[PDB]
Design an enzyme around this catalytic site. Sequence first.
Site, PDB file in Angstrom:
ATOM      1  N   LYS A 174     -19.739 -51.897  49.086  1.00 23.85           N
ATOM      2  CA  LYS A 174     -19.719 -50.753  47.747  1.00 23.85           C
ATOM      3  C   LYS A 174     -18.254 -51.294  47.110  1.00 23.85           C
ATOM      4  CB  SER A 203      -7.607 -43.337  44.031  1.00 22.11           C
ATOM      5  OG  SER A 203      -6.369 -43.821  44.634  1.00 22.11           O
ATOM      6  CG  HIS A 232      -1.358 -44.806  47.783  1.00 20.24           C
ATOM      7  ND1 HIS A 232      -2.485 -44.749  46.572  1.00 20.24           N
ATOM      8  CD2 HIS A 232      -1.921 -44.200  48.658  1.00 20.24           C
ATOM      9  CE1 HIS A 232      -3.652 -44.432  47.177  1.00 20.24           C
ATOM     10  NE2 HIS A 232      -3.316 -44.127  48.495  1.00 20.24           N
ATOM     11  NE  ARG A 291      -3.952 -36.226  49.857  1.00 24.68           N
ATOM     12  CZ  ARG A 291      -5.236 -36.601  49.244  1.00 24.68           C
ATOM     13  NH1 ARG A 291      -5.356 -37.307  48.247  1.00 24.68           N
ATOM     14  NH2 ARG A 291      -6.217 -37.109  50.142  1.00 24.68           N
TER      15      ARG A 291
HETATM   16  O1  EP8 Z   1      -6.978 -40.609  48.772  1.00 24.23           O
HETATM   17  C1  EP8 Z   1      -6.279 -40.914  47.835  1.00 24.23           C
HETATM   18  O2  EP8 Z   1      -7.056 -41.247  46.636  1.00 24.23           O
HETATM   19  C2  EP8 Z   1      -4.774 -40.810  47.286  1.00 24.23           C
HETATM   20  C3  EP8 Z   1      -4.138 -41.514  46.232  1.00 24.23           C
HETATM   21  N1  EP8 Z   1      -2.890 -41.248  46.554  1.00 24.23           N
HETATM   22  N2  EP8 Z   1      -2.806 -40.543  47.365  1.00 24.23           N
HETATM   23  C4  EP8 Z   1      -1.488 -40.212  47.997  1.00 24.23           C
HETATM   24  C5  EP8 Z   1      -0.742 -38.894  47.161  1.00 24.23           C
HETATM   25  C6  EP8 Z   1       0.174 -38.430  47.822  1.00 24.23           C
HETATM   26  C7  EP8 Z   1       1.103 -38.868  48.706  1.00 24.23           C
HETATM   27  C8  EP8 Z   1       0.456 -40.306  49.305  1.00 24.23           C
HETATM   28  C9  EP8 Z   1      -0.698 -40.601  49.035  1.00 24.23           C
HETATM   29  C10 EP8 Z   1      -3.799 -40.236  48.198  1.00 24.23           C
HETATM   30  O3  EP8 Z   1      -3.942 -39.900  49.455  1.00 24.23           O
HETATM   31  C11 EP8 Z   1      -4.109 -40.346  50.610  1.00 24.23           C
HETATM   32  C12 EP8 Z   1      -3.512 -39.611  51.741  1.00 24.23           C
HETATM   33  C13 EP8 Z   1      -4.019 -40.651  52.963  1.00 24.23           C
HETATM   34  C14 EP8 Z   1      -3.644 -41.945  53.146  1.00 24.23           C
HETATM   35  C15 EP8 Z   1      -4.568 -43.042  53.479  1.00 24.23           C
HETATM   36  N3  EP8 Z   1      -3.734 -44.058  53.265  1.00 24.23           N
HETATM   37  C16 EP8 Z   1      -2.573 -44.050  53.037  1.00 24.23           C
HETATM   38  C17 EP8 Z   1      -1.769 -44.893  52.610  1.00 24.23           C
HETATM   39  C18 EP8 Z   1      -0.307 -44.488  52.046  1.00 24.23           C
HETATM   40  C19 EP8 Z   1      -0.449 -43.191  51.699  1.00 24.23           C
HETATM   41  C20 EP8 Z   1      -1.151 -42.173  52.120  1.00 24.23           C
HETATM   42  C21 EP8 Z   1      -2.478 -42.681  52.454  1.00 24.23           C
END
Ligand code: EP8
Lengths: 154, 154, 155, 157, 155, 157
Positions: free
Chosen positions: D41, D127, D17, D90
């Site tokens: 939730k 997460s 993130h 991803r």
């Molecule tokens: O889904 C998760 O819990 C989670 C934790 N880390 N990353 C992540 C892992 C690698 C790279 C970028 C994120 C995740 O993937 C989410 C991908 C979708 C997404 C939705 N909102 C966002 C805001 C910023 C970045 C991504 C997203």
Amino acid sequence: MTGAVCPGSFDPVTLGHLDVFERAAAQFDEVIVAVLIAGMFTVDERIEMIRESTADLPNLRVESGQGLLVDFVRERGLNAIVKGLRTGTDFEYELQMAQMNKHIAGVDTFFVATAPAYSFVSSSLAKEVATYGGDVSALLPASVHQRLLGKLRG
Amino acid sequence: MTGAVCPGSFDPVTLGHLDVFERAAAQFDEVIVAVLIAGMFTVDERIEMIRESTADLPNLRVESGQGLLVDFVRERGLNAIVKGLRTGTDFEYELQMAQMNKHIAGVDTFFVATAPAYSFVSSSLAKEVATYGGDVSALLPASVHQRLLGKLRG
Amino acid sequence: MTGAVCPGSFDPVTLGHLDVFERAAAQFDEVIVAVLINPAGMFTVDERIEMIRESTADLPNLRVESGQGLLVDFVRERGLNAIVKGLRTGTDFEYELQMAQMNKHIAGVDTFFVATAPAYSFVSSSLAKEVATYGGDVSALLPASVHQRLLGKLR
Amino acid sequence: MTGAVCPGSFDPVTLGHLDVFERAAAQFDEVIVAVLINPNKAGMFTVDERIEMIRESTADLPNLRVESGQGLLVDFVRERGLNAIVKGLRTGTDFEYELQMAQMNKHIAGVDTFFVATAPAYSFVSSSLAKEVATYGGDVSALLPASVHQRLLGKLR
Amino acid sequence: MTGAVCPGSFDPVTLGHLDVFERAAAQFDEVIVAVLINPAGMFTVDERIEMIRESTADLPNLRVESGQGLLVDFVRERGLNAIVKGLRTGTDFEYELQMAQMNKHIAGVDTFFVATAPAYSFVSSSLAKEVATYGGDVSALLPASVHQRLLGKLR
Amino acid sequence: MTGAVCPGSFDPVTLGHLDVFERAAAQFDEVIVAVLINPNKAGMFTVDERIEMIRESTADLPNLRVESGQGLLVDFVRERGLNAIVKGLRTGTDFEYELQMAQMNKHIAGVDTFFVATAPAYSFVSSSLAKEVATYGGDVSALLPASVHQRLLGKLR
Ligand SMILES: O=C(O)c1cnn(-c2ccccc2)c1OCCCc1c[nH]c2ccccc12
Ligand SMILES: O=C(O)c1cnn(-c2ccccc2)c1OCCCc1c[nH]c2ccccc12
Ligand SMILES: O=C(O)c1cnn(-c2ccccc2)c1OCCCc1c[nH]c2ccccc12
Ligand SMILES: O=C(O)c1cnn(-c2ccccc2)c1OCCCc1c[nH]c2ccccc12
Ligand SMILES: O=C(O)c1cnn(-c2ccccc2)c1OCCCc1c[nH]c2ccccc12
Ligand SMILES: O=C(O)c1cnn(-c2ccccc2)c1OCCCc1c[nH]c2ccccc12
């Protein structure tokens, strides 16, 4: 004597579904829409909404169903299912089901590609967006839309 | 008066293709296999191989074709294409074609899932393996197989 | 000595699983099938273990145990550092690739995959149970011993 | 004054993130990280905790701020006079799912969505998986910012 | 100042491309459409540039240039370090994710993607040209100016 | 005595390949890297060059050796008394393609295939893309072993 069953929960039926109904009805002698039966609309409500939107398709009827889909199909003298596919996930999931259904009962499945305009539509996203006040009127039959607005207000 | 065109190069036709031919013929009143026309077998050879393997399907015929598939389909009074799908890549590629074909000419496309036993079969992998002496006899109609062996020796 | 742990819920074991068991046992000096104890299913863990043992009677270098908690802990506690399992579909691959990369990151344990036998690519335990519950015939998808016991649970 | 909203549950924020936050902040005049809460939730971390963990690891991004919200994301975006969402992808599943949401969001509200590809090092990070692994003692310290790791261990204890 | 380069062959530009041009120009202070000169197509680079300029006449912060060689060089030589383009399909995503990660690795240049408009998801330049060649009607997939010139090339 | 063949063009070998070589060698008693040559199309590097680059970067893997071949891979495998192939997968396309080849290879010859997931850092790496990028001056030094990088620059000059 060609025919196919078009199964789903249709809660509610969308323009995506309806497009597939019309397309199946154009290629098969009979089409049965099978409303499978914990959602927003009752089975009867779902059937009613579908019947209203398919009045112009003479060779289509709508019924509720329970249990194994392949039994529903065979008890009606048919051995084909027809469905639309939007995404790669749709394809992967439905291919699994189709192969299982053909294995256990000899019932085949025919897929059509979504209309491009409706590829992002699901009944669960439409209900969700509508709940928070988003305009989904372009994604649902005019009748269904009014029924939806009624459900959220009541 | 239902019907569909089943298009491909069929160089050579495989048991995967043949399974889809039988399945389409079981659900449509007529099926035309359209051999589209730089490979191993000539168009006539491909047509012959298909005709031999489909003698038991009365409502199926085989023809060569050129140019736009949707013109081939409409010039014969039909407006449906039928094909099998093995993989996610098949689905993605064919969905694109199906939507383009429906857009330009109103011709629809129906897909069926591969038989599980043949999901890895392609005409180009079969020819490749056979070239180097691998046994592909379980993947091809008995007739086709003999024709293949002849091509590699000559 | 080479070896790998083959993890799963196996509720029940299918011919797909069994094919992978045989193929793993053909290539590694030892294979441990790990039956996960969860929160839930049709068969008890002991029932699942017995069904696997019956179906794998001809694999002398494969044994069956139950486990819980972090899989990479189970693997390392047994002096191994490889996991082995099958893949049917693109979703299997995407999901299992994530888990494998996480497992190697946190513990250095590697994961080896084999492609499903084509005949069983559509098989899952959940779908087999669902179909059988409504009377569908799934006998060609399960080992003989499992099918009988499945009929027993549905009655 | 260009701008985008970067939405998520961030329960907790990960290094994946944060990488996206940085890349978004480099290309838009302002970035608002939207911590979207389900009032029905609860997650592992409270809204104040999630925001605090994000702020502590984004202190050197002067054009980024953090706000919570709920309901339709496109309303959150438009109420700030913006009409762009930015997030990472991803996997192929992420792309399929997010394309549907993006097309729905542009359809109902005209709000657009921009995606960036995950940093390769964090492609397997989520997460939920980090929380699950940590619950059973696995070391996820290299996947999460300093602002997160020990608070996460604290919740699990 | 924010900005991005929007690269492609655009042989010819489609309504899908144009939608992405407009959406990029709505969000970045400047957009440079980069028309790649290759080894090959239907339209010359100058023809492609003119067709894009006609179709983007109402986007004052978008300009059109030709380029060759390493895209990240083109981007950085113009004081930018972002690429922007659309994605239609899973294969688009898989392919473009690889390229984006490579481009960020080698040069620090980032890539932003937008989802295709649903109406044009199946559109490609190659398929449009193929269809039009055999007389199919692709007028609803291309800007007005392009369709006319396409008819001209097929005669 | 367990064993597997790790096949490829390796034109040139990359760090992604080497990571897989190491992981395969850790789990099989012997690993044979099979440099498969198309006698009808030359690559960038000759067979001797490809082998040399692999050997130089695998010197600390005592149970790995390198041999070239052509024709059906399953014949190469069986002629060495083995019946396992091992390789890496990076993407969904790799999985689709390699599953087809694996199923075909087991069908015709009973030879099995084992796959490992790419190291996240190298998931975007391919020999073709590395060569293409390097051709136009891009820095691929972090994607290739020392045994490769300068020979590659040499070929391009
Ligand atoms: O889904 C998760 O819990 C989670 C934790 N880390 N990353 C992540 C892992 C690698 C790279 C970028 C994120 C995740 O993937 C989410 C991908 C979708 C997404 C939705 N909102 C966002 C805001 C910023 C970045 C991504 C997203
Ligand atoms: O899943 C949904 O809620 C939902 C709502 N609309 N559409 C749709 C969107 C675009 C095109 C065709 C439908 C959906 O996708 C379902 C796709 C699978 C499917 C199962 N049964 C069917 C019967 C007819 C047509 C499709 C299906
Ligand atoms: O691509 C090939 O060479 C090839 C050889 N056999 N099969 C096959 C393997 C398993 C099942 C059905 C076919 C192939 O896959 C083609 C799939 C797309 C397709 C286009 N036209 C068709 C006509 C009938 C059936 C399929 C198609
Ligand atoms: O998911 C299931 O219930 C289920 C039932 N049978 N098969 C199967 C079908 C065809 C081939 C190999 C299995 C399934 O797929 C699971 C695939 C993932 C997997 C996890 N652990 C495993 C252990 C051995 C083998 C596979 C796995
Ligand atoms: O590939 C093509 O020929 C082609 C023709 N139209 N569209 C399109 C169809 C629908 C939506 C956006 C484009 C295509 O897809 C290309 C998608 C990748 C892409 C590379 N460079 C780009 C620049 C702007 C936009 C997209 C791209
Ligand atoms: O395809 C390439 O050119 C190329 C260059 N590096 N990597 C790689 C990148 C990251 C991880 C593992 C390899 C590639 O991907 C190939 C993946 C398929 C594969 C076939 N044979 C193999 C032998 C060993 C390892 C992989 C393979």
